[PDB]
Amino acid sequence: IVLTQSPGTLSLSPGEKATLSCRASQTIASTYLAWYQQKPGQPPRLLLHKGYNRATGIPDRFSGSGSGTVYTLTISGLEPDDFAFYYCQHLGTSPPYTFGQGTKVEIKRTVAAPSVFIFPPSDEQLKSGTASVVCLLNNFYPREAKVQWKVDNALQSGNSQESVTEQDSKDSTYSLSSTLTLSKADYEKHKVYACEVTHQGLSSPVTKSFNRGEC
Amino acid sequence: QVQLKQWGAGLLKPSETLSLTCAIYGESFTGSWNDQLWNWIRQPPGKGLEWIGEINHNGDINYASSLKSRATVSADRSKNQFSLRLRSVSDADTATYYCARGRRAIVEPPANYGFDVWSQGTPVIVSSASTKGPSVFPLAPGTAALGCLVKDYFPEPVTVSWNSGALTSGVHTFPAVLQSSGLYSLSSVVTVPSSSLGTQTYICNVNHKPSNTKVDKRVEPKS
């Protein structure tokens, strides 16, 4: 049984009602559907079992509903502790068991464009035989962002790694680094290094660039 | 008050056999109503929960289809413990591994058809690297950004602070990434006013306890 959760990300303010959906590929009895909450760095925690029954100690604001192929987890008034990931699970009469892919409940806030910065490899690193170029996207919302690396106007692929911070506790934004790695040899064969950023807060893509070896 | 305690090596070289055991406290292996389900679950980096396998009260063992060949699940009933082995591990098997208690009971017992008790989990990281301190390189600068690149260390964690930890406003220390070399790398950045680049010193303090590495790196604007 394939369990598909939606939406991927739910964005809400504290105190609003949250509705999370889990769609099964086939009809399943409600007895066999459970829901879990998980915060990062912590084990999951059972919220509901048998579709609608709250587990021990679970607050009244969590409830379950549905039948057939669609089930729902409702949170009637989000508290700060409720911003987390949620998973549905099919625990039937026998294995195998399946989890949904997860839904993230985040704090909603107004759209914010990222500030973009590019960093050439340091002279200290180049002395080592490696070249790393870092593109920074600072304090943006929503989390969805596109970062494309161009070297001498050639789209780069498979030589970059991204890392994203968790949602900020102060202003509810995200920040993101993209790091392009090439050998020192390849770094010195090219002139123009650019990161192109697309984000809902930018009316057109923002490109930050440098020329290798220019002051 | 049921609890699961997990142990086993979490830093694995590639192709080795992952070996984990959980100890049950507060419950018997079968249960009063012969309904206990002892399960293994993993969570790959940035992905959701994936069910691995189970041994139940009657000794029945079942595995997920994509792991059935490489995995073995067993229990030692004399010590109220159960175990998972997973052979020929690769980067694909890097994950946080949990054991959990479920039940299928047929006053109804609590948490029927749910996993109510979970262990703290083991972070399993597959790398042929040995312990290695990071190299620390500067990322040089109305608003100016600067930072440090903390590259090629093993294992986690690294702590990064700025001016000995005084500075946290506008600091972003990014979750580390595992590079293809088996070595971690991360960057730590801070956005500061441009007008402070000549009066305030910015130093990134990097501590890597496994290698006893301690690096204080001044990040200065280039001229």
Residue numbers in the entry:
A (entry chain L): 2 to 27, 27A, 28 to 95, 95A, 96 to 214
B (entry chain H): 1 to 31, 31A, 31B, 31C, 31D, 32 to 82, 82A, 82B, ...
Lines from the paper:
In this study, we investigated a donor who developed a family of potent HIV bnAbs with different lengths of an insertion in a critical framework region following infection with two founder viruses that were closely related and underwent extensive recombination. The bnAb lineage is defined by a CDRH3 length of 22 amino acids (aa), an IGHV4–34*01/IGHJ6*02 heavy chain (HC) and an IGKV3–20*01/IGKJ2*01 light chain (LC) gene. A greatly reduced ability for donor plasma to neutralize N332A Env-mutated pseudoviruses of different clades identified the V3-glycan bnAb site as the major target for PC39 neutralization breadth.
(e) Ribbon representation of PC39-55C with 4aa CDRH1 insertion. In contrast to the 11aa-insertion Fabs, structures of 4aa-insertion mAbs 50E and 55C revealed a more flexible and more difficult to resolve CDRH3. When compared to other V3-glycan bnAb Fab structures, 11aa-insertion mAb HCs (17A, 23D and 50I) most closely resemble PGT135, which also has an insertion in CDRH1, while the LCs of these mAbs are more similar to that of PCDN-38B, with an RMSD of 0.48 Å (S12(A) Fig). The 4aa-insertion Fabs 50E and 55C could not be as readily compared to previously described N332-dependent bnAbs due to their CDRH3s, which are not completely resolved. However, we were able to fully resolve the CDRH3 of another 4aa-insertion mAb 50L and show that CDRH1 participates in stacking interactions to stabilize the CDRH3 despite the shorter insertion length. These differences in CDRH3 stability between the two antibody clades might explain contrasting neutralization potency despite similar breadth. For the 4 amino acid CDRH1 insert, stabilization is less apparent. However, in both 4 and 11 amino acid cases, the acquisition of a triad of tryptophan residues from CDRH1 and CDRH3 is observed, but it is not yet clear what the functional and evolutionary consequences are of this particular feature.
